[PDB]
PDB file of C-alpha atoms and ligand atoms in Angstrom:
ATOM      1  CA  UNK A   1     -93.739 -90.181 -28.226  1.00 52.76           C
ATOM      2  CA  UNK A   2     -91.942 -93.783 -28.455  1.00 50.73           C
ATOM      3  CA  UNK A   3     -94.560 -96.167 -29.004  1.00 51.19           C
ATOM      4  CA  UNK A   4     -93.234 -99.266 -26.732  1.00 52.21           C
ATOM      5  CA  UNK A   5     -90.535-100.516 -24.383  1.00 52.27           C
ATOM      6  CA  UNK A   6     -88.987-103.505 -24.717  1.00 54.59           C
ATOM      7  CA  UNK A   7     -87.279-104.639 -21.659  1.00 52.80           C
ATOM      8  CA  UNK A   8     -84.991-106.906 -20.617  1.00 51.95           C
ATOM      9  CA  UNK A   9     -85.381-109.767 -18.084  1.00 52.18           C
ATOM     10  CA  UNK A  10     -82.225-110.299 -15.870  1.00 50.15           C
ATOM     11  CA  UNK A  11     -81.585-106.857 -13.783  1.00 45.91           C
ATOM     12  CA  UNK A  12     -84.458-105.249 -14.965  1.00 49.22           C
ATOM     13  CA  UNK A  13     -87.780-106.805 -14.269  1.00 50.25           C
ATOM     14  CA  UNK A  14     -86.193-109.270 -11.877  1.00 50.82           C
ATOM     15  CA  UNK A  15     -83.264-111.313 -10.826  1.00 51.88           C
ATOM     16  CA  UNK A  16     -82.522-114.964 -11.484  1.00 55.77           C
ATOM     17  CA  UNK A  17     -78.528-114.634 -11.061  1.00 56.12           C
ATOM     18  CA  UNK A  18     -79.142-115.683  -7.318  1.00 55.38           C
ATOM     19  CA  UNK A  19     -80.801-119.188  -8.422  1.00 54.47           C
ATOM     20  CA  UNK A  20     -78.030-119.649 -11.314  1.00 52.93           C
ATOM     21  CA  UNK A  21     -75.098-119.057  -8.152  1.00 51.71           C
ATOM     22  CA  UNK A  22     -76.570-121.885  -6.181  1.00 51.50           C
ATOM     23  CA  UNK A  23     -77.333-124.323  -8.835  1.00 51.72           C
ATOM     24  CA  UNK A  24     -73.655-124.322  -9.796  1.00 54.44           C
ATOM     25  CA  UNK A  25     -73.244-124.548  -6.184  1.00 60.08           C
ATOM     26  CA  UNK A  26     -75.344-127.519  -6.380  1.00 62.46           C
ATOM     27  CA  UNK A  27     -73.868-129.251  -8.797  1.00 59.52           C
ATOM     28  CA  UNK A  28     -70.258-128.714  -7.373  1.00 62.07           C
ATOM     29  CA  UNK A  29     -71.245-129.702  -4.105  1.00 62.24           C
ATOM     30  CA  UNK A  30     -72.312-133.249  -5.998  1.00 60.41           C
ATOM     31  CA  UNK A  31     -69.036-133.509  -7.808  1.00 63.83           C
ATOM     32  CA  UNK A  32     -66.554-132.391  -5.518  1.00 64.25           C
ATOM     33  CA  UNK A  33     -65.150-129.508  -6.661  1.00 63.05           C
ATOM     34  CA  UNK A  34     -64.062-126.795  -3.981  1.00 59.30           C
ATOM     35  CA  UNK A  35     -64.358-123.504  -4.526  1.00 57.56           C
ATOM     36  CA  UNK A  36     -67.685-122.297  -5.696  1.00 59.52           C
ATOM     37  CA  UNK A  37     -68.533-118.762  -3.819  1.00 62.75           C
ATOM     38  CA  UNK A  38     -70.317-115.603  -4.316  1.00 61.57           C
ATOM     39  CA  UNK A  39     -66.776-114.270  -5.124  1.00 60.81           C
ATOM     40  CA  UNK A  40     -66.018-117.185  -7.700  1.00 60.93           C
ATOM     41  CA  UNK A  41     -69.360-116.367  -8.782  1.00 60.18           C
ATOM     42  CA  UNK A  42     -68.699-113.003 -10.284  1.00 62.46           C
ATOM     43  CA  UNK A  43     -66.487-114.739 -12.954  1.00 64.96           C
ATOM     44  CA  UNK A  44     -69.682-116.577 -14.170  1.00 66.62           C
ATOM     45  CA  UNK A  45     -71.631-112.640 -14.598  1.00 64.23           C
ATOM     46  CA  UNK A  46     -73.031-112.872 -18.511  1.00 67.18           C
ATOM     47  CA  UNK A  47     -70.731-116.233 -19.183  1.00 68.23           C
ATOM     48  CA  UNK A  48     -72.699-118.968 -21.095  1.00 67.38           C
ATOM     49  CA  UNK A  49     -73.709-121.897 -19.592  1.00 69.21           C
ATOM     50  CA  UNK A  50     -70.813-124.164 -21.351  1.00 71.59           C
ATOM     51  CA  UNK A  51     -67.770-121.289 -20.454  1.00 71.97           C
ATOM     52  CA  UNK A  52     -69.424-121.427 -16.663  1.00 72.18           C
ATOM     53  CA  UNK A  53     -69.657-125.552 -16.324  1.00 69.72           C
ATOM     54  CA  UNK A  54     -66.098-125.088 -17.912  1.00 68.94           C
ATOM     55  CA  UNK A  55     -64.388-122.480 -14.863  1.00 64.58           C
ATOM     56  CA  UNK A  56     -66.104-124.717 -12.246  1.00 61.78           C
ATOM     57  CA  UNK A  57     -64.089-127.687 -13.566  1.00 61.21           C
ATOM     58  CA  UNK A  58     -60.856-125.879 -14.318  1.00 57.23           C
ATOM     59  CA  UNK A  59     -60.966-124.960 -10.029  1.00 58.15           C
ATOM     60  CA  UNK A  60     -59.674-129.022  -9.712  1.00 60.61           C
ATOM     61  CA  UNK A  61     -58.038-128.793 -13.545  1.00 61.76           C
ATOM     62  CA  UNK A  62     -61.316-132.142 -13.992  1.00 58.70           C
ATOM     63  CA  UNK A  63     -61.062-133.432 -18.061  1.00 58.01           C
ATOM     64  CA  UNK A  64     -64.457-135.122 -18.958  1.00 57.09           C
ATOM     65  CA  UNK A  65     -65.791-136.113 -22.245  1.00 56.63           C
ATOM     66  CA  UNK A  66     -68.192-134.190 -24.234  1.00 56.84           C
ATOM     67  CA  UNK A  67     -71.098-136.670 -23.345  1.00 56.65           C
ATOM     68  CA  UNK A  68     -70.602-135.923 -19.303  1.00 58.16           C
ATOM     69  CA  UNK A  69     -69.689-132.508 -19.619  1.00 58.67           C
ATOM     70  CA  UNK A  70     -73.398-132.508 -21.438  1.00 58.17           C
ATOM     71  CA  UNK A  71     -74.933-134.297 -18.828  1.00 54.28           C
ATOM     72  CA  UNK A  72     -73.406-132.210 -16.577  1.00 53.90           C
ATOM     73  CA  UNK A  73     -74.924-128.704 -18.135  1.00 52.59           C
ATOM     74  CA  UNK A  74     -77.731-130.270 -18.313  1.00 53.03           C
ATOM     75  CA  UNK A  75     -78.248-130.882 -14.247  1.00 52.37           C
ATOM     76  CA  UNK A  76     -77.467-127.555 -13.712  1.00 54.40           C
ATOM     77  CA  UNK A  77     -79.758-126.210 -15.319  1.00 55.07           C
ATOM     78  CA  UNK A  78     -82.091-128.622 -14.060  1.00 53.17           C
ATOM     79  CA  UNK A  79     -81.371-127.485 -10.475  1.00 50.06           C
ATOM     80  CA  UNK A  80     -82.130-123.826 -11.308  1.00 53.56           C
ATOM     81  CA  UNK A  81     -85.596-124.892 -13.239  1.00 55.04           C
ATOM     82  CA  UNK A  82     -86.322-126.535  -9.841  1.00 52.58           C
ATOM     83  CA  UNK A  83     -85.225-123.185  -8.116  1.00 55.84           C
ATOM     84  CA  UNK A  84     -87.199-120.929 -10.258  1.00 52.64           C
ATOM     85  CA  UNK A  85     -90.228-122.570  -9.933  1.00 52.68           C
ATOM     86  CA  UNK A  86     -90.636-120.752  -6.526  1.00 52.05           C
ATOM     87  CA  UNK A  87     -90.315-117.447  -8.412  1.00 53.94           C
ATOM     88  CA  UNK A  88     -93.574-114.798  -7.053  1.00 56.53           C
ATOM     89  CA  UNK A  89     -95.087-112.013  -7.811  1.00 55.81           C
ATOM     90  CA  UNK A  90     -92.743-110.152  -4.662  1.00 57.48           C
ATOM     91  CA  UNK A  91     -89.590-110.820  -6.462  1.00 56.81           C
ATOM     92  CA  UNK A  92     -90.776-108.491  -9.472  1.00 57.48           C
ATOM     93  CA  UNK A  93     -87.804-105.469  -9.504  1.00 55.39           C
ATOM     94  CA  UNK A  94     -89.508-102.113  -7.281  1.00 57.32           C
ATOM     95  CA  UNK A  95     -91.481 -99.404  -9.720  1.00 57.95           C
ATOM     96  CA  UNK A  96     -91.610-102.610 -12.979  1.00 57.06           C
ATOM     97  CA  UNK A  97     -95.301-103.523 -12.201  1.00 57.24           C
ATOM     98  CA  UNK A  98     -96.924 -99.288 -12.215  1.00 56.42           C
ATOM     99  CA  UNK A  99     -94.647 -98.971 -15.486  1.00 56.84           C
ATOM    100  CA  UNK A 100     -96.157-101.522 -17.037  1.00 59.07           C
ATOM    101  CA  UNK A 101     -99.849-100.917 -15.742  1.00 58.07           C
ATOM    102  CA  UNK A 102     -98.799 -96.908 -16.942  1.00 61.36           C
ATOM    103  CA  UNK A 103     -97.322 -98.589 -20.334  1.00 60.62           C
ATOM    104  CA  UNK A 104    -100.429-100.487 -20.719  1.00 62.58           C
ATOM    105  CA  UNK A 105    -103.220 -97.731 -19.911  1.00 63.87           C
ATOM    106  CA  UNK A 106    -101.276 -95.022 -22.397  1.00 66.31           C
ATOM    107  CA  UNK A 107    -101.652 -97.738 -25.097  1.00 64.05           C
ATOM    108  CA  UNK A 108     -97.625 -98.616 -25.464  1.00 68.33           C
ATOM    109  CA  UNK A 109     -96.331-101.391 -26.646  1.00 68.29           C
ATOM    110  CA  UNK A 110     -94.604-103.808 -24.045  1.00 66.57           C
ATOM    111  CA  UNK A 111     -92.671-106.640 -25.522  1.00 68.15           C
ATOM    112  CA  UNK A 112     -89.593-109.245 -23.551  1.00 67.71           C
ATOM    113  CA  UNK A 113     -86.176-108.979 -25.381  1.00 71.27           C
ATOM    114  CA  UNK A 114     -84.814-111.481 -23.345  1.00 69.56           C
ATOM    115  CA  UNK A 115     -82.209-114.464 -23.749  1.00 69.03           C
ATOM    116  CA  UNK A 116     -83.811-116.034 -21.208  1.00 71.01           C
ATOM    117  CA  UNK A 117     -85.616-119.378 -22.172  1.00 71.40           C
ATOM    118  CA  UNK A 118     -87.737-119.075 -19.085  1.00 70.12           C
ATOM    119  CA  UNK A 119     -88.996-116.308 -19.964  1.00 68.90           C
ATOM    120  CA  UNK A 120     -92.661-117.047 -20.330  1.00 71.11           C
ATOM    121  CA  UNK A 121     -92.794-118.954 -17.687  1.00 72.57           C
ATOM    122  CA  UNK A 122     -90.810-116.462 -14.857  1.00 71.15           C
ATOM    123  CA  UNK A 123     -92.991-113.862 -16.332  1.00 70.11           C
ATOM    124  CA  UNK A 124     -96.060-116.498 -15.659  1.00 67.72           C
ATOM    125  CA  UNK A 125     -94.554-116.520 -12.140  1.00 66.82           C
ATOM    126  CA  UNK A 126     -95.026-113.267 -11.559  1.00 64.14           C
ATOM    127  CA  UNK A 127     -98.530-112.543 -12.780  1.00 66.01           C
ATOM    128  CA  UNK A 128     -96.477-110.099 -15.691  1.00 63.30           C
ATOM    129  CA  UNK A 129     -98.052-112.078 -18.964  1.00 63.69           C
ATOM    130  CA  UNK A 130    -101.383-109.611 -18.859  1.00 64.02           C
ATOM    131  CA  UNK A 131     -98.901-107.322 -19.866  1.00 66.22           C
ATOM    132  CA  UNK A 132     -97.126-108.392 -22.688  1.00 63.33           C
ATOM    133  CA  UNK A 133     -97.938-106.919 -26.166  1.00 60.32           C
ATOM    134  CA  UNK A 134     -95.172-109.722 -26.948  1.00 63.83           C
ATOM    135  CA  UNK A 135     -92.158-111.891 -26.056  1.00 66.81           C
ATOM    136  CA  UNK A 136     -89.318-112.317 -28.258  1.00 66.20           C
ATOM    137  CA  UNK A 137     -88.104-115.693 -28.712  1.00 66.40           C
ATOM    138  CA  UNK A 138     -84.704-116.124 -27.844  1.00 66.26           C
ATOM    139  CA  UNK A 139     -84.458-119.926 -29.389  1.00 69.49           C
ATOM    140  CA  UNK A 140     -85.460-117.490 -33.116  1.00 65.63           C
ATOM    141  CA  UNK A 141     -82.557-114.901 -33.010  1.00 64.40           C
ATOM    142  CA  UNK A 142     -79.232-115.875 -35.145  1.00 66.63           C
ATOM    143  CA  UNK A 143     -76.706-114.071 -32.509  1.00 68.72           C
ATOM    144  CA  UNK A 144     -76.959-112.792 -29.288  1.00 68.92           C
ATOM    145  CA  UNK A 145     -76.203-109.483 -27.458  1.00 69.16           C
ATOM    146  CA  UNK A 146     -74.759-107.538 -28.093  1.00 65.41           C
ATOM    147  CA  UNK A 147     -76.378-108.171 -31.851  1.00 65.20           C
ATOM    148  CA  UNK A 148     -78.986-106.016 -31.416  1.00 67.96           C
ATOM    149  CA  UNK A 149     -81.149-109.260 -33.076  1.00 70.19           C
ATOM    150  CA  UNK A 150     -83.631-109.534 -30.217  1.00 72.41           C
ATOM    151  CA  UNK A 151     -84.375-105.789 -29.601  1.00 73.33           C
ATOM    152  CA  UNK A 152     -85.539-105.508 -33.260  1.00 71.47           C
ATOM    153  CA  UNK A 153     -87.395-109.272 -33.467  1.00 69.69           C
ATOM    154  CA  UNK A 154     -88.721-107.330 -29.712  1.00 71.88           C
ATOM    155  CA  UNK A 155     -90.342-104.355 -31.785  1.00 68.91           C
ATOM    156  CA  UNK A 156     -91.235-106.187 -34.646  1.00 69.91           C
ATOM    157  CA  UNK A 157     -93.567-108.555 -32.704  1.00 70.02           C
ATOM    158  CA  UNK A 158     -95.281-105.333 -31.647  1.00 70.06           C
ATOM    159  CA  UNK A 159     -95.957-103.091 -35.032  1.00 74.12           C
ATOM    160  CA  UNK A 160     -93.159-101.607 -34.469  1.00 75.83           C
ATOM    161  CA  UNK A 161     -89.623-100.394 -35.992  1.00 76.50           C
ATOM    162  CA  UNK A 162     -86.505-100.238 -33.168  1.00 75.90           C
ATOM    163  CA  UNK A 163     -86.201 -96.255 -33.877  1.00 76.54           C
ATOM    164  CA  UNK A 164     -90.087 -95.627 -32.457  1.00 79.24           C
ATOM    165  CA  UNK A 165     -89.089 -97.610 -28.633  1.00 79.72           C
ATOM    166  CA  UNK A 166     -86.609 -97.206 -25.263  1.00 82.47           C
ATOM    167  CA  UNK A 167     -85.418-100.329 -24.470  1.00 82.83           C
ATOM    168  CA  UNK A 168     -84.488-100.883 -20.805  1.00 81.54           C
ATOM    169  CA  UNK A 169     -80.770-103.036 -19.830  1.00 81.06           C
ATOM    170  CA  UNK A 170     -78.840-103.689 -17.099  1.00 81.70           C
ATOM    171  CA  UNK A 171     -75.965-105.087 -18.906  1.00 81.97           C
ATOM    172  CA  UNK A 172     -73.340-103.165 -21.609  1.00 78.95           C
ATOM    173  CA  UNK A 173     -74.168-105.528 -23.565  1.00 81.40           C
ATOM    174  CA  UNK A 174     -77.457-105.250 -24.050  1.00 85.19           C
ATOM    175  CA  UNK A 175     -77.201-101.567 -23.630  1.00 84.83           C
ATOM    176  CA  UNK A 176     -75.288-102.132 -27.374  1.00 84.39           C
ATOM    177  CA  UNK A 177     -77.601-104.060 -28.588  1.00 87.14           C
ATOM    178  CA  UNK A 178     -80.122-101.665 -28.557  1.00 87.63           C
ATOM    179  CA  UNK A 179     -78.533 -98.885 -29.411  1.00 89.55           C
ATOM    180  CA  UNK A 180     -77.953-100.540 -33.087  1.00 87.68           C
ATOM    181  CA  UNK A 181     -81.496-101.658 -33.158  1.00 85.62           C
ATOM    182  CA  UNK A 182     -82.011 -98.084 -33.296  1.00 83.48           C
ATOM    183  CA  UNK A 183     -83.847 -97.955 -29.886  1.00 86.46           C
ATOM    184  CA  UNK A 184     -83.094 -95.213 -27.127  1.00 83.61           C
ATOM    185  CA  UNK A 185     -81.388 -97.222 -24.196  1.00 88.07           C
ATOM    186  CA  UNK A 186     -81.762 -96.390 -21.074  1.00 88.89           C
ATOM    187  CA  UNK A 187     -79.357 -98.664 -18.874  1.00 84.21           C
ATOM    188  CA  UNK A 188     -80.077 -98.992 -14.966  1.00 83.95           C
ATOM    189  CA  UNK A 189     -76.832 -99.875 -12.736  1.00 84.36           C
ATOM    190  CA  UNK A 190     -73.823 -97.461 -12.764  1.00 87.13           C
ATOM    191  CA  UNK A 191     -71.403 -95.670 -16.166  1.00 84.93           C
ATOM    192  CA  UNK A 192     -68.847 -98.177 -15.156  1.00 86.27           C
ATOM    193  CA  UNK A 193     -70.249-101.496 -16.836  1.00 87.28           C
ATOM    194  CA  UNK A 194     -72.925 -99.130 -18.691  1.00 87.56           C
ATOM    195  CA  UNK A 195     -70.919 -96.360 -20.367  1.00 85.76           C
ATOM    196  CA  UNK A 196     -71.079 -92.539 -20.043  1.00 84.85           C
ATOM    197  CA  UNK A 197     -72.739 -91.980 -23.194  1.00 87.94           C
ATOM    198  CA  UNK A 198     -76.631 -92.926 -22.582  1.00 86.02           C
ATOM    199  CA  UNK A 199     -78.809 -92.024 -19.641  1.00 85.58           C
ATOM    200  CA  UNK A 200     -78.594 -94.498 -16.279  1.00 85.50           C
ATOM    201  CA  UNK A 201     -81.011 -94.820 -13.266  1.00 81.90           C
ATOM    202  CA  UNK A 202     -79.418 -96.003 -10.222  1.00 83.47           C
ATOM    203  CA  UNK A 203     -82.252 -98.686  -9.866  1.00 84.64           C
ATOM    204  CA  UNK A 204     -85.394 -99.406 -11.524  1.00 86.77           C
ATOM    205  CA  UNK A 205     -87.294 -97.297  -9.091  1.00 88.82           C
ATOM    206  CA  UNK A 206     -86.658 -94.346 -11.196  1.00 90.56           C
ATOM    207  CA  UNK A 207     -87.921 -96.586 -14.370  1.00 90.35           C
ATOM    208  CA  UNK A 208     -91.506 -94.488 -14.055  1.00 88.79           C
ATOM    209  CA  UNK A 209     -93.484 -92.913 -17.416  1.00 85.43           C
ATOM    210  CA  UNK A 210     -92.457 -89.354 -16.743  1.00 87.55           C
ATOM    211  CA  UNK A 211     -89.150 -90.414 -16.199  1.00 87.98           C
ATOM    212  CA  UNK A 212     -89.598 -92.333 -19.699  1.00 88.90           C
ATOM    213  CA  UNK A 213     -90.442 -89.325 -21.125  1.00 89.67           C
ATOM    214  CA  UNK A 214     -88.550 -87.114 -20.177  1.00 91.98           C
ATOM    215  CA  UNK A 215     -85.781 -88.780 -21.874  1.00 92.27           C
ATOM    216  CA  UNK A 216     -87.555 -89.649 -25.187  1.00 91.08           C
ATOM    217  CA  UNK A 217     -88.568 -85.960 -25.538  1.00 89.93           C
ATOM    218  CA  UNK A 218     -84.549 -84.494 -24.951  1.00 87.91           C
ATOM    219  CA  UNK A 219     -83.748 -86.698 -27.494  1.00 88.43           C
TER     220      UNK A 219
HETATM  221  F1  LIG B   1     -82.211-111.330 -19.241  1.00 88.75           F
HETATM  222 AL1  LIG B   1     -80.968-110.496 -20.216  1.00 88.75          AL
HETATM  223  F2  LIG B   1     -79.639-110.334 -21.108  1.00 88.75           F
HETATM  224  F3  LIG B   1     -80.647-110.096 -19.109  1.00 88.75           F
HETATM  225  F4  LIG B   1     -81.780-110.837 -21.185  1.00 88.75           F
HETATM  226 MG1  LIG B   2     -79.769-107.774 -17.891  1.00 87.19          MG
END
């Protein structure tokens, strides 16, 4: 049986994406750039903060110094951090708390394998800290998803090899990272985004211990 489950955070445990969207809206409003709506936000999907900022400046063909650029990125992050103070246990996705409990009671290791710089904070706000054996620090990995570094770090932190683990992800790039770590991926979302060579569930309520066992055995 698998010995560990390696969890991505956004789109698996909870959604941060709305707070991000709203942080950018506020920044855009503050600096007087029209066009930062939900539709435009699609183009900020898994895009870095600096690249996202660039797309926003591009809406008004605005040019800035390196220092102004840096300051604007900082302000968006300040907004974001402010907005996430109200994350609560009610923002835990469906199925996830029960999975954590079942994994822990079956002595299966639990690790966070997220690029969120606010991982420990958000887990604490959702009252989930006690279930985690480890959080792989994204500041300490050389390369982000689709590189496997973060999943490898996560597995190692709980005393296992990636090959003894399941990885849970909502992004193609994350799925690819899990593959390359040697862990077994189970995606959540649709095959359009994720690929169709891996097991995928439609939402997180399908992530149960029973289902993960099913998948592990058939592999
Ligand atoms: F929290 Al993620 F890819 F969604 F690191
Ligand atoms: Mg994700």
